[PDB]
Homo-oligomer: 307 residues x 5
């Protein structure tokens, strides 16, 4: 089991496709291992660049293919470097961009807190043939300055795990198990755009839904309420292209459903108020005085639907 | 006919393009076959990695090209591995991403139940030259946890079929027939997003279409009904970008057509009620009392259009 | 002139980009020719797979490059096969996906009838050096089952034509002429989605445009008509993203222009009716009784604009 | 200075990205030059196809790389052909698709007249090492038949120019200058779609803006005018996705700004008419009679904003 | 430390993805260095073109890989040239397109002033093995002519810096430090499109929000205000697809929030005016006379929200 030391320098994280739960990570990967000693020209290390490492591999030099488990497709790799040292150690540096996938949990879409996971593993060599000793992830080029769409909180957690595989049991009897590296970078979404553009107008429209009751006759109350639905429909088609589709309901969508329930509540109370006239002569006072009780009640409802 | 054992490990299924009936499958494919025995360095199996299997193929090593029948383009393959054993068996492991196509049937778009089909077949070698013995599909990394947009129900069904070809009859007289593997993974769509965002507002708008009749004069009934159409038009341009185009009509679209038929029904009954005045003096009572019969009738109509 | 027999197996046709008049065709192409006889190992034909035909080509084996004339870019080819027979014939099988272009005529966009054209031609070898003998196109995997967005009507017509070129006259004096194969697959669009979602609401909105006249006073007639425009504007921004842009006007767009002309017609008749008051006292009866003549007249107009 | 004869056969021009000022050109390029005479097998010219010219180039055959100056990225080249003649001349044929860029001037977006520019130049060889003798551009497969989105007017103008470079002065003292070919194909946009879908409804809405004044009281005039803005806003979000963004204002956008200025003009005249009541008793006649002077005045304004 | 002279000719800058803070730069890069003298055929410099430099690199010729630090993926390189001189100097010319990233600061989105940064650095050779002497950036093909979406102000600033790396300390003890080149091209956005299409209608709608108060009764004031919200909602879904998402609020979005605050302000003053009736008989004069004080106050507010 040859010892391999991995260093992952995360250049930048961007392109968080919330639709597909993918995110593009750019960076560098550096693998250090020690093999047989060899003769180099001088004591200078021998640097082999891209479109030239492949000739050394065809010659018989051992370069492992450290794949990414959670990647989409194949990483659009850039330059690659191979330093052969006269001491006997080999350093493989590479630049990678990749669309990585993760099980993002969108419980609170404005206020989300996920982790970007890079999962690195040897493709063919098991634990008895290649073992990852340690990884230090240099998340240093990543920095939040309150303009970034994701605040990257803290450092990056590194984990060296050992993973067995069911599908390699048929081809390998007892050694079908691979070493693996998990790099988790905890990030929180910047909620200020959604707070200042997609939530405050819901508050204004729901306040308007409270203020619709101030009219003293029923027909233009109905016309006002149908104008409102339209308004709520227009702003519901607004914010229909920013967020993914999940079984449970994200915060913007409870606000939209709360707006729908409000406008309808207005419908049912004005129809009931029109039908409180038992003989067509009794006025509407106790149910028409909901201009201060219904607003506070739906403030409580909205406080529930935010918490 | 050399026996080939195939193991397909489905890593993840995503990107279901309902527009094009394509879906991206990531995974690994492992082909086991047995050829002539050979001399390897030691009893250790010889592992040949990517950009190095091609040299062995050019040397004269037999590696079949197991194509995907239902794939879009060519699969964006990643790392590939070839283990040559001193016993005499060869194991070809490969990582594939592919846009696969299937005849998806969108009878009930919120409540759909399809199957993702991976169709694997040798490209050039017929049944007399290469026969698939067995396939076990390790659908294990796939798991539903009620956040996924598709619930993957049960295991994956495997089928080894034998398929003849008409276009290879002109070039091969009697042996133009190929072995084939069909892997079907039954999946059901998560309907909760469509139920809680795209169907309940139809219920509210159609209930509003029922409540439009409570006004006691005809002109602002017409103005209210024209406001409503607009509302139904706005929400009909909503949900115009989520679903494909088919000959028959999916559940959201019967709800939209039902809304159109409702609003118009409101138009025709209020024009008829205005024209029930035979001499301009007869009032409208029996046709204006549809605030409790028309709603239940269209509840029955909606129950038909959901079932 | 070596005789080449071509067999094109159309796997599936999809992705009809009406914007760009391109469509993606997946399939296989099989070229049969006869050259010098050669010695093969045994009487078994020699099969040469992908990333190995190129070595035979570099050795000196003659493989023509049968290009597609009407393709966009280069076809994303998959696996390729070359059978060399001891008899003396060579069979080149290949799997191709291509974005093909054609002069689509969108006279009736819901009810369109076009033909998908695959135009195949040798890239460098003229008629005196390579002649296409016959083509049989196996359009068999293509089948309509009334869910497909295009019904493929009948078989595929094959045509072997002879095409001269002006730009190759300067480099080739008398033989600048190439053989060519045209494969035309006649298809008709499935109109049921457009009939049941994009035409019937025009009928409802135009019927509403007829029913706008039932109001007995002029000001709220104007307000209703301005609400209607908005409605027609909203549904005109609907269906603005499904169809291409042409000089002449497709069926949906005559319906939209007919709706605009209707609503305006309503404007001009109500302004004229308000101005039929010569001294401000004469009522409006003969021009206000267009609730049964204007609807039938625009039924005739719509029958013209559909036929 | 070796003489190179270029023939560019433009197959088709499409994909005019007005957003990015790029357009995709498909076609063929044929370079004729004369070098040292050579021995070929027979008097038949020797044809070298794609993935085989590179071996001749590595052998020592001189093939220049005729780059495109105004291309986006690298051209997605297809098949390439190299005819070596026993006489001594070499013909390099190639099929190219490219995203080409040009300084498109969108002064009149419905009625635009631009030119598609293909700029071809040797990458490394200056004028003293490679000189373009003549170019004839065979724009023949391009034809307008009044369905195309661009009418291609006339032939293609060819220009052989000589261009110096500042950045190659530091590496080449006196010969840093390259020959160049400019091919300009003048095209005019098909305006009929914009005339019949994006300009006539502006005329109808502005005519409605003229007809808003016919109401005899002020409050519902204001409500009608606020309905109108909404209408103008809805149709202003319509046609927000077809055209690029420029400093000056294209014809659709002067029509939208003219509509905004109209509706507001209606606002200011009805507020002024309500404020012409000096003591609340004086009626509004001279400023309310703008139902025939304001429409003709804004006909003149629109005639200015079209010309 | 071999001296390398770099010349970067920026052909064109376009495709500024404000969503991803990426921009596509096309251009040429020319590296001059001096190595061992060599024998060339004649005194003519030896030019080695693309798909032929790699053979010289495999032979043993030293060509450094000058990577881009801030690039997305790998640059879609085009033609490459290598001039070997008999004097002893080597010139490597290359054509590159790249998606480059930068920390764009969107404080004033119509009136933005950023800088496009190209960051060039040797991939493997440190300062002791390769040192950049000087760079002159020939920003000459870039020119503004008041049609471009970005005005490129002034020349391009060049900077030769020295950058240490933490992740290369584990593999290189004392020399882990690389020379680097930063090219900054200051650009300002063309604001005229946003001024003439996305800001002036906000002024008109807010002026309408001021003029809503002229009605003399409360119910249709409320209906007018609900029509207005809808208007503000429709134009708020307008301009929802042009700009990125940031923590702080860009100029269009303060205008949208200012419009929301206006319409609501109208709501609260008309509810308060209706509630200033202490016994239902006191009229509303002092709070209804805000048709000239509220407009100027919100002119001051808008002057704050623009400055």
């Amino acid at each position: 089991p040859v010892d391999v030391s991995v260093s992952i320098f995360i250049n930048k994280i961007y392109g968080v496709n919330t639709l597909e739960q993918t995110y593009k990570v750019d960076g560098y990967i550096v693998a250090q291992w020690t093999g047989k000693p060899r003769k180099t020209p001088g004591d200078k290390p021998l640097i082999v660049e891209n479109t030239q490492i492949e000739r050394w591999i065809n010659n018989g030099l051992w370069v492992p293919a450290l794949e990414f488990i959670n990647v989409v497709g194949s990483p659009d790799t850039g330059n690659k470097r191979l330093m052969l040292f006269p001491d006997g150690r080999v350093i493989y540096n590479a630049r990678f961009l990749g669309s990585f996938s993760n099980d993002m949990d969108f419980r609170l879409f404005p206020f989300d807190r996920q982790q970007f996971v890079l999962e690195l593993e040897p493709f063919s060599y098991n634990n008895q043939q290649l073992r990852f000793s340690d990884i230090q992830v240099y998340t240093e080029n990543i920095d939040n300055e309150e303009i970034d769409e994701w605040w990257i909180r803290g450092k990056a957690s590194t984990h060296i795990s050992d993973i067995r595989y069911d599908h390699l049991s048929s081809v390998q009897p007892n050694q079908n198990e691979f070493s693996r590296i998990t790099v988790r970078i905890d990030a929180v979404r910047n909620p200020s755009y959604y707070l200042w553009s997609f939530i405050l107008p819901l508050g204004l429209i729901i306040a308007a839904s409270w203020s619709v009751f101030w009219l003293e006759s029923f027909s233009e109350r109905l016309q006002t309420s149908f104008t409102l639905m339209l308004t709520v429909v227009a702003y519901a088609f607004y914010t229909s292209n920013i967020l993914p589709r999940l079984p449970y309901t994200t915060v913007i969508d409870q606000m939209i459903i709360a707006g729908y329930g409000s406008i309808f509540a207005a419908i049912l109370l004005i129809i009931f108020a029109h039908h409180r006239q038992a003989n067509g002569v009794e006025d509407d006072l106790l149910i028409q005085r909901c201009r201060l009780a219904f607003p506070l009640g739906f403030l409580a409802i909205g406080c529930v639907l935010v918490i």
